[PDB]
Design a protein around this nucleic acid. Sequence first.
DNA 1: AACTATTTATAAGA
DNA 2: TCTTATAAATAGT
Lengths: 90, 87
Amino acid sequence: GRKKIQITRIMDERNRQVTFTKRKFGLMKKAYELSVLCDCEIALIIFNSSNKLFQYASTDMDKVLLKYTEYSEPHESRTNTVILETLKRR
Amino acid sequence: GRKKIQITRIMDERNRQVTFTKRKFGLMKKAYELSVLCDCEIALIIFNSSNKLFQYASTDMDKVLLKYTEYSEPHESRTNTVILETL
DNA sequence: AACTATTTATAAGA
DNA sequence: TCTTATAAATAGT
């Protein structure tokens, strides 16, 4: 990036859409590279704010999702949590 | 990277494992940033070569997967396909 | 595991 | 979309 940007929701609609398209390609690209380099199985489902779907899966999506739903051990899972935060002085 | 690397399976076991751990964090990180920045719902399931699971989901994994299985329109889908290559 | 040069991604300005 | 300068990730150590 020509500038550092904060990680909060982009407010400009068209900016949000461009950022979405490029970052999504980059993310599927990094997913592909992870799967190849480290010999692992990835499935990546993305729904844009308008509920349109975009997906990546190394092997085969329904294979990976089946394996998921049957997996019955504790495992590393991360998520998004919203925090209350005070801003800078300005 | 201190070196450019080819995109093929890392042969050294321990190298593969370190690369896995760091790149996975980076990938979940970029996923989180995408979901926040562009207000979208992501689900990312990874099974390492030993069949151990690692996951990221912005909202809630079963929510996203339900939405997936019901989605009935054509959509952008990618996968990995193997190519023959000269050196 | 941390730290650093080299690469890979990406945001602003066009 | 493109260009470019800048920030962010990562491959070796």
